[PDB]
Design an enzyme around this catalytic site. Sequence first.
Site, PDB file in Angstrom:
ATOM      1  N   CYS A   1       0.824  -1.201   0.000  1.00  0.00           N
ATOM      2  CA  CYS A   1       0.000   0.000   0.000  1.00  0.00           C
ATOM      3  C   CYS A   1       0.863   1.258   0.000  1.00  0.00           C
ATOM      4  CB  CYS A   1      -0.934  -0.006   1.211  1.00  0.00           C
ATOM      5  SG  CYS A   1      -1.812   1.541   1.502  1.00  0.00           S
ATOM      6  N   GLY A   2       0.823   1.997  -1.105  1.00  0.00           N
ATOM      7  CA  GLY A   2       1.614   3.205  -1.265  1.00  0.00           C
ATOM      8  C   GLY A   2       1.267   4.303  -0.276  1.00  0.00           C
ATOM      9  N   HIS A   3      -0.020   4.458   0.017  1.00  0.00           N
ATOM     10  CA  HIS A   3      -0.459   5.418   1.020  1.00  0.00           C
ATOM     11  C   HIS A   3      -0.021   4.985   2.414  1.00  0.00           C
ATOM     12  CE1 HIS A   3      -2.862   8.123  -1.474  1.00  0.00           C
ATOM     13  NE2 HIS A   3      -3.263   7.055  -2.140  1.00  0.00           N
ATOM     14  N   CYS A   4      -0.045   3.678   2.655  1.00  0.00           N
ATOM     15  CA  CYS A   4       0.377   3.122   3.934  1.00  0.00           C
ATOM     16  C   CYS A   4       1.855   3.402   4.183  1.00  0.00           C
ATOM     17  CB  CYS A   4       0.110   1.614   3.985  1.00  0.00           C
ATOM     18  SG  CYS A   4      -1.559   1.127   3.499  1.00  0.00           S
TER      19      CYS A   4
END
Length: 111
Positions: free
Chosen positions: A30-33
């Site tokens: 997850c890039g946002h994570c």
Amino acid sequence: HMSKHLYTADMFTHGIQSAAHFVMFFAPWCGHCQRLQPTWNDLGDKYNSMEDAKVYVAKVDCTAHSDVCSAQGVRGYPTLKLFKPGQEAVKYQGPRDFQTLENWMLQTLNE
């Protein structure tokens, strides 16, 4: 960076019944994570060590505990939930900068 403040499944189950927890359900892909990790670490560093802490900041790696994320009805990543012992959990939705996260957590704690 994502290693910090990780909970086991067992730590999650018991923790949310012992004290208020702001929990980040995430995935390594997850890039946002990923971008959120340093902010969440700061939140944890400030609050998890406090004497007589009223809130704890933790993470649950969904790829490590798919059963937990399934049981928490996780939709999309990251998912930010504030658990309060006895009460029902509240999913956070909004900007994910430190000041906003902290302020929302604090306001939501005393409700």
